[PDB]
Amino acid sequence: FRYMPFSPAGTPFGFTDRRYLTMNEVGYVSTVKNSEQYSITVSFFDVGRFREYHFEDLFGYDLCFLNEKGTLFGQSKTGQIQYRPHDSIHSNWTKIIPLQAGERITSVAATPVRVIVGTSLGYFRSFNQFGVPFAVEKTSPIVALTAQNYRVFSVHYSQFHGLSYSLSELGTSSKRYYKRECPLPMSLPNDANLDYYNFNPMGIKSLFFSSYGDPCIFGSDNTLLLLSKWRSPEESKWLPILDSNMEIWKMSGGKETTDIHVWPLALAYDTLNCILVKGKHIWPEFPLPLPSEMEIRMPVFVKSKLLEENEIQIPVSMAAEEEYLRSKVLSELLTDTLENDGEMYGNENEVLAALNGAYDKALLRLFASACSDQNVEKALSLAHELKQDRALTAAVKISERAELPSLVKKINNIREARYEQQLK
């Protein structure tokens, strides 16, 4: 197996002399072949904040990582890296990574405080933002890296386990692992896009931390996977939170298309920032379209049932079930964030409050459908899952309006039982 240089959302040359080195919510980095060298362009989506620029690449950088403070470049065969801060206040710096025979740099990453380099032999080299080395570590062969502040999300590959991942924090002291080489349940590629899989054999279109700090990955199946409960090693699980193939299907009015593709940039809370690629190839071209937003949806919709209810229109009862599950997942993730790391983005407390509100509201709609179907047992189980005590009150009023007096008494037992915990 041959390790190819990986960068988030990078594209292959194909039949052109240009491609995108990397791409995320900050911007995009492209490279163009001219004469014998390369012309690299660093562009930004917030044009007012940073200025697009270009420079001549005499080394042939094939690895790149972009953040809000700088851009990191790497040369997979020679081992040379360069960090270029966006502001000219801070100076660029260059370093050459030692490489053994046949060893390549497979992935690089950078935050405002850390620079990470991973190799095909499993060498994990970390630096501060100025190039001061901190530690050289030997792990399993690395195929993809991403980072956010002091935390690193690494993907590994051997012939034994397949794909695994590690989750670590590079604090001011020693490197600590939250997760060490756990199974990565991302589907591996299994025709017109053969150039892409020669360029990216694992099919990892992109990976990143969410805006709230949760690791995400986006493979060839075009499904956004989010790692939940990663602070508890025994409770961590990967959650499919977006089937982008299904969303494109619903956007096309329920018609199977083969000309629209999703290119992932980032996950902002509940929205996937992406490029909607229209064309024969699954990767974006030149010029780059404006970024789009695709809201995440739990994969619970069935095409056959959606066709009977007719852009595709969703029945309010089926839409409530998805909204309940999505609010449940997002509420649990954000609660774990606030209970351990506190605020990062600045609106998490208000988002969580609205999140719990939408949770109970969607749950109450399912509760009304159960009452309409005279299913008192299913209604009681739905009432047990309610969060707010005022939502239990709303459920009582729906039960009275449905003339189910036995249900009213059982829901009032829930309210009394919670009020008893309030007395302890």
Partner: peptide, 15 residues
């Protein structure tokens, strides 16, 4: 039998 709940949901919105 569809049940009217929209008024109860708006009552839940009030803070």
């Amino acid at each position: 039998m569809d049940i009217x709940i929209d008024d109860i949901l708006x009552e839940l919105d009030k803070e």
